[PDB]
Amino acid sequence: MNIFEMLRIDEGLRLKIYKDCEGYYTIGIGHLLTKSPDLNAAKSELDKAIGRNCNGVITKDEAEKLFNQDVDAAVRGILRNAKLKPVYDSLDAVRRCAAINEVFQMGVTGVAGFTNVLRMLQQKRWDEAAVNLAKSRWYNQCPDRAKRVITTFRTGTWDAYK
Ligand SMILES: [Ca+2]
Ligand SMILES: [Cl-]
Ligand SMILES: [Cl-]
Numbered sequence: 001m002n003i004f005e006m007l008r009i010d011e012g013l014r015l016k017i018y019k020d021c022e023g024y025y026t027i028g029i030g031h032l033l034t035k036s037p038d039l040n041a042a043k044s045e046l047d048k049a050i051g052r053n054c055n056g057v058i059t060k061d062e063a064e065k066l067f068n069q070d071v072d073a074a075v076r077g078i079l080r081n082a083k084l085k086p087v088y089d090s091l092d093a094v095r096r097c098a099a100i101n102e103v104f105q106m107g108v109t110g111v112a113g114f115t116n117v118l119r120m121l122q123q124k125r126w127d128e129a130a131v132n133l134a135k136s137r138w139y140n141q142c143p144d145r146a147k148r149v150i151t152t153f154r155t156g157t158w159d160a161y162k
Contacts, residue, residue, distance in 0.1 A: 001158045003071060003097050007104060009161055010145055013063060017042055017056050021142035028063035030105065031070055074100050077108040084111065087118045095121075098152040105145060106138050121153070130154035 011030030017039070020026040025033045025042035031049070033042035046054045050062055058066075078084045078099065088099055103111050112118075114136070120129040130150050133139060139146040148160035 001161055003100050004067070006097055006101060006161055007067070007071065010101065010105075010148065013060070015057055015059070015063065017046070021145055027058060027066075029067040029070075031063075031066045032107075070104060071100065074104040074108075078103055081108050081112055083115075083118060084108065087122045090122050090124075092156055094156045094158060095153055098149050101149050101152075102138075105142070105149075110138065126154050126156070 008029060013029060014027060017025055017027050017033065020030075020032070024035050025039065025045075027033060027046060033045040033049075036042065043054075043056050046056065046058065049066060050058060078088050084099075084103070088096060091099060114133070117129050117132045120126075120132065130153055133146075133150045133153065136146075139150065151160040152158070
């Protein structure tokens with residue numbers, strides 16, 4: 001088990017443009033196209049991401065190329081953020097996977113606003129953090145995409161994906 005297998009379970013594959021739990025336009029392995037309510041914008045966003053007229057539908061190899069890029073972006077997003085990096089770097093290996101997962105799904109900005117959870121995580125207060133994440137807007141709207149991640153932050157094992 002690793003971050004790619006983890007996200008493949010959580011986001012699955014979709015080779016046609018769907019609206020995600022947050023209500024935004026998405027494709028592949030959880031690749032967000034835009035937060036605009038306009039489908040045709042997301043349709044052009046796909047074409048721009050791949051380098052061709054898709055046009056709303058991509059292949060499996062292209063999805064995996066986007067997936068590598070997005071996981072890279074999530075890691076870089078964490079390391080570049082002053083709030084997230086010190087918390088991240090305090091985490092053990094498995095919880096760091098949960099952290100990459102949450103940023104991949106929610107984006108850096110959303111996550112960095114969870115100020116008290118970040119504090120609880122840095123001080124290894126796993127139970128409270130789990131509870132506080134459980135009452136998030138992320139969790140309440142995306143409970144199936146979020147559930148295993150919260151549990152991972154609590155236990156620091158891979159058991160929720162087993
Ligand atoms: Ca690392
Ligand atoms: Cl892999
Ligand atoms: Cl969900």
